[PDB]
Design a binder for this molecule. Structure first.
Ligand code: YVN
Length: 101
């Protein structure tokens, strides 16, 4: 197995922006522990010359979600959005960031 190159843990929202703005592919993303919602997570995605942010929401059942579809894990939420757009207004598919070993 191998660890997921998308979990950055505790990193400021603005830092996620600086990092993702340097990626070249739209969809480059990362999950970070929320700064406005301590104890939760946020998803930051590169799209054009901007970095969009999404709240990773939770329900009383412990599920994770962005919109209506609910997932049992962060991993499944992430993977689902590699083939279905994370945005309703735009077609944005998640793709791992390019990192040099
Ligand atoms: C300045 N405020 C924002 O960044 C708006 C961001 C937002 O609304 N994003 C759009 C959106 O419509 N999000 C939906 C879906 C979602 N799950 O975020 C929503 N607001 O419920 C998205 C299409 C770019 C919502 C946001 C606010 C905080 C946040 O966590 P954090 O950055 O850690 O403080 C993550 C996202």
């Amino acid at each position: 197995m191998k660890p997921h190159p998308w979990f950055f843990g505790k990193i400021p929202r603005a830092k996620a922006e600086e990092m993702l703005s340097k990626q070249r592919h739209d969809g480059a993303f990362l999950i970070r522990e929320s700064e406005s919602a301590p104890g939760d997570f946020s998803l930051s995605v590169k799209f054009g010359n901007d970095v969009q942010h999404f709240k990773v929401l939770r329900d009383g059942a412990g599920k994770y979600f962005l919109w209506v579809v609910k997932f049992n894990s962060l991993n499944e939420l992430v993977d689902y959005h590699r083939s279905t757009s994370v945005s309703r207004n735009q077609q944005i598919f998640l793709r791992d960031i390019e990192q040099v070993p």
